[PDB]
Assembly symmetry: C7
Homo-oligomer: 288 residues x 7
């Protein structure tokens, strides 16, 4: 049904530095294609078969079903049928779900790749940094970390990975958007094509008509889903490029009492789970 789709797609010492306020972007870019595919072939809208041939009155049920199946499997053979637009729109109308799944997988892969290998190292590094900071504060209440900060600043082995990971997703979004823009530009009449069953010995028989009629079914639904995906992706595109400006958008709090941008972001997002942080916030917020 539909209740089994929306309730599972969107209704369903560990730092949150992995997602970087980008988990929502991946979730909405990977679950939307799946949700649209599930609702397109649901038991409510996809009532009829995707293809329905118009066989003559002389034909029985079996011959008409054979014509239907043949014309369904003769879409790829250019020598069988003929259309003014060509076989590319028919190919797209036949293989839209598979390429939608391909785009879904292309979106899903890079975040999992980032989480699998590049997440544990920086996360353990940030636990180490926060533990050292807490120890320093406890000692002061009752300095070598700055050296680590400047050495990490001199490092260049992590920001490149982040920008590559968050540029691959933008490239995939651009490709999907331009593809859907091309797809929505179809004349919407290409589903009308003439199917001819005259292959092999069937040439001798004259009872079968030379050419048939065949219109694809459930084509407007594909167009509506495509335009919905197009508008969602064009709305979402600026978010990723806004994220890409990491160094252009905390650590300097205690005062007396380059890859550095990523570490700064991870440090400033982690203010919770430690009691001393909020106490210092209030103490040098009242003073300043």
């Amino acid at each position: 049904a539909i209740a089994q789709l929306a309730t599972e797609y969107v209704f369903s010492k560990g730092l949150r530095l992995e997602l970087a306020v980008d988990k929502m972007v991946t979730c909405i870019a990977v679950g939307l294609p799946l949700l649209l595919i599930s609702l397109a072939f649901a038991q409510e809208i996809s009532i009829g078969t995707q293809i329905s041939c118009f066989s003559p009155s002389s034909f029985s049920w079996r011959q008409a079903a054979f014509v239907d199946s043949y014309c369904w499997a003769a879409v790829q053979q250019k020598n069988s049928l003929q259309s003014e637009s060509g076989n590319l729109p028919l190919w797209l109308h036949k293989f839209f779900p598979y390429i939608l799944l391909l785009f879904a997988i292309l979106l899903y892969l890079p975040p999992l790749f980032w989480r699998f290998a590049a997440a544990p190292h920086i996360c353990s590094d940030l636990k180490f940094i926060m533990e050292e900071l807490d120890k320093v504060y406890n000692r002061a209440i009752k300095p070598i970390v700055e050296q680590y900060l400047k050495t990490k600043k001199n490092s260049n082995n992590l920001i490149i990975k982040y920008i590559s990971c968050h540029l691959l997703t933008l490239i995939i979004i651009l490709l999907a958007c331009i593809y859907l823009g091309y797809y929505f530009s179809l004349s919407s009449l290409s589903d009308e094509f003439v199917c001819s069953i005259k292959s092999g010995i069937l040439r001798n028989d004259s009872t079968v008509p030379d050419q048939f009629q065949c219109k694809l079914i459930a084509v407007g639904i594909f167009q509506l889903l495509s335009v919905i995906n197009l508008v969602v992706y064009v709305l979402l595109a600026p978010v990723v490029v806004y994220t890409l400006f990491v160094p252009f958008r905390v650590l300097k709090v205690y005062e007396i009492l380059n890859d550095l941008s990523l570490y700064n972001l991870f440090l400033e997002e982690n203010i919770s789970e430690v009691k001393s942080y909020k106490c210092l916030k209030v103490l040098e917020n009242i003073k300043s």
Copy 2:
């Protein structure tokens, strides 16, 4: 069935300050469309296909099924069929479930957005505040928090987010209500339309009649669900605007013994889980 819908839609150191007595509003505004969609296409009411063409007696099963499928997929093509009202009512009758799902998602998004990013900061802040208050009371039994309170009062970075989040939902409710008001105003006869299969080479044949008959099925159910949603939403609308008046509707309890409104609400809703609160309540309730 129906037992699998109602039992899962409504029958199915952590502060509750996230929901602010508004979790019920989101739940009833997001589960009702899903419940109605599930019951509309249940195995009890949606017995018949949404479309049933009346083919002549000469046609066999296959030709009639082809006519049915074509007219189902010819609703979008304005050049095929013709109706006095136009193709807009037919579009709505075809795509009602998808736009209902769209409204469901539009309701579901803002609460999750609020819970994902704006909830942890204020929640950790309130644990800090209550811990400081408990420490102050324990010290008194055996003052810097007021400075934090007035600094938070001078702040303006949280109330704006709350009012925007709870105004977006009101805007979406208004849009859904006006749309359903338009939809219920349909003449209920627009489902009667004339379908003609005369596209392409089928022009040569004269056996097929020029024009057919075609009435949509399961249309009154859509109207009843639409009016039910309309009445529910018009009843629910005042609740959100009542909530929006946060500063116009506790902290001053112990006595001797602007974003401030949100913090005041979160403080007054959190009186449980601490033993000293009820003891103070009784002590300066007997005295005052």
Copy 3:
């Protein structure tokens, strides 16, 4: 089947003061409609379609199916069919499951509303009261709570909510019972109605007969379920009004060694989980 319904509907420091020996009433008033709806449309009784038109012999399968679907969707249009009783009984026979679900939701809502907001405050209050009582008894073994009791007695902010919550349910039961009384009073012949397919250009054709026959199917099952619900609700009605008399139906146990009614009930129902209660019961039961 049926095994999946009965086994899940009825076979499937925390005080129990929320339910107040009324959880059973809500459970039997909310699960019975669901159980009846599930068994009505089970794979054992709902074998046949709800509607079966009698088309002439000339018509083929497709024309008869079209007549069936049209007459199913022409029940709401008063200008199509005609019956002596009117279109109200037909409306009821078509929309019985939906209104049953509506009554189920109307029963389910008030208990959840009471549990969501009015339960935690009084429950935390009763833990506070019992903890204070236990501390007082421990001190005596090795008095300010009475002041709290009399102040709560002077309060009037909780009994009104309880009586309103347990009067709304009675009102809904009365409405459901009177509706089912009206429904069972149907002549049981209203399912016989004459359906005419003469809308639009089909006027020109003379092959179609002017008027058809159409009897609804699975109508007696609805009547039996309605009368079962009626008898269950009329039997259940006195229970709620008996509950409503809260102040007219413990705390005075230890002796030397108005909203007050609700607190008294919650106190007397909570005698378990504390060891001193039973010891005092036996000590001043032997003496008195």
Copy 4:
């Protein structure tokens, strides 16, 4: 199938005093109707529809299906069909599953009622009694409970509830057994009845025959299930009346070293979970 029924019906500081060696009786009296209903409508035996009308050769598929549905829904109308036995056997053959479910619910209710309200009080009482006994024994190793025992003996507020609860079940068993005895006494030919479709304008037409034939299907299965339930219940009946004699069927163990019957039973069934009980058993078993 069948594997999903038997494996889930019978193969699937807390005292066990709630069940009193009667949990098996409730389980076998509540799961047997469900198991029989599930196996009756399984995908192995219930292959055919419950009703099969014999329409003439002139009728097509649709007219025969309409006759089938009408005669299925015309069983309740006494003016349509006619049988020598009457409409009561037909009513029973139509509504056997629903009344079986009704008997199942009538068996299920009283044990849950007993467990919900009358179980916690006596169970907490027995933990109190056993704790006091253990404390007394520990003190003796290194007497006020008898007063509690005699006061409970003078009480009369619990045995009445138990006997009423275990007499209601016997009454329901008697009613079910006598009903099944009546049902098995059917002539087994009442399923043969004459169905006439001559209601309304169909009177004018002469093509339809005046009277039809109609035999119910899957009727012997109902008779076999009914007789199986009858024999099971008549075998089970003496168990409940044997249980009812509670005072006529331990506490006097330690020696030097009326509702009383229920407490005595609960005490003697609880000898486990305490180490001193078995030690005393052996010590004054060797001596006596």
Copy 5:
């Protein structure tokens, strides 16, 4: 399918004295009927309906289906059909699955009865015995249990229950084996029977032939399952009678350093979970 059957039937301070190396016998005697029933009506072998009537050419689909259903429900009526063997083989061919389920339940009941009531008492007794033995050994490292052993030897209230429980199962196995021996002895031609639809007013009509043909389908599968069950049960029978000789097949280990048979078995099977047992085993194994 089949993967859902085998993986769930056989692939799917607490002493193990309950099973007494007999859990396997109960498991294989209760899961085999269920497995065979599930595989008999699987979606691979039970492709065809159990009954297929041969109606004449004049009959349409509906009349043939009515004949099929009638002859399916006319097997019990001896006056309708006639066969040389009689109606007993037809009864068996119709009700084989139900009696197989009955045998499955008859096997399942006695082990659960033994585990429910007779298991906890002896199990708690054996924990008491092993704890006393461990305490005695600890005291010796740094005698009243023998009195308990001889008193239990003088007792006769447990061995009788065990032998009755393990003789009831043998009786049920004997009954099932002799029944399957009778069933496999069928001539395998009894499924050929002549069905006549001439009941009631249908006597007047002459179009229907006087007598029909009707052969049951999926009958050889039942015979193969019956013979498989027969061979399994005849192979399994000696195991139970071998078990019954409990006193004829440990405690005398430490040395210086009648119901008694059951306690001896339970003691000797429980050598694990205690460290001193294996140490004593090696110490007086080296010496003796």
Copy 6:
């Protein structure tokens, strides 16, 4: 589908001495038949019914279906049909899945029998041995076990059970392999057989032809699965016989600082979970 088969068959103080690097052999010998059976009757390949009779043109749907069912159930009766090869190949083609399940159960039984009864004793023995060894090493850091080792060496009550258990599996593999070798040797034309419906009174009628045609369907799939199982089993056979040579393939590690083979294997496989083992390994690995 297929995703539900492969993901659940192969993708889905406790010593591992039970399996002895033979758990994989049992898993691949018990899950392969189940996987092959599941994929054979999947919703992708088993599209068509196993049997398809060629009835004449005069026959309608019902007579052809009756012929199909009869010939499906007339395979066992040798007097009905006739084939040059005989009824044995037809029996095998009909009952291949059941005998495959039988082989699966025959493989599954012996490992479970070994794990149920013979595993706990030796496993507890090995915990005792390793605990004694650890205690001896701790005492040495700050000898009676050798006596236990030689007494176990003199014992002969466990190796026989192991060799019998791992020879029964080899015997079953040999039987399955030779059976599949016979089955693959079928002429593959035995599925062509002549079916005659002339039993009983149908002899009088002359419309039915004397002999029919009937070819089994989904027979090549069975042959391919059989040859796959054959090659897998012939490849797997040497593994079991390699395992059987237990005494011909550790304990002598510490040095200064017959059933014995099984205990030696269990000891040498258990080097983990104890810290002293690896330390000794390195200490007398550097020295030797």
Copy 7:
């Protein structure tokens, strides 16, 4: 559907040294065939049967279905049909899913074999090594491990197993890629073949035509899935050979303060879960 495939295939003191940054390769090489097989036979694309025969007009439904089934099961018999390409392409088109599952199993086996037997030994070895290193560092703060390192360097019993395990997978990938390259090279017309039903006595009849037409359906989908698998595997191939160069791609960190490659990799990947590692990293990162 499709939502049940992608969400479960890719969306769904313990060291991670088992996977060695190769878990992703196994996951994508084992889940892709399963995902493609599931989507190929989904309820959206696999609408039509794989085979559709074109029977003449004289044939009824049953004869056409028999022809369909026969030609489906006559693909293997070379003497029945005839095609210019041969029976090999038809064999491949019939058995593509089974060989895809075979390749999936061939990929799945080696990683599980490596994890089952070769993982625990080296993993326990690495816990021992890291514990010894931590103890050495703690002693230094308040050397025999190097001897273990050089002895392991002299060992040659583990690198061979790793290279064999990661070369078997490469061999299987090469075989799958070359097979798919052959399969995609099919002329795509081989699905056109002539089927003749003239086996056995059917030779006498002349009504059946000598030769038929038969085109396979859902063949282009197989080609697209094959080419997708081909491109994925050819892209993935260099990853495995890059991994194979283990010795050519840490331990030397503390300084004053051959199978060796695998141990070095496992050591350098395990820097987390120990506090001293990061502290040493910063200390001799600032100095060097």
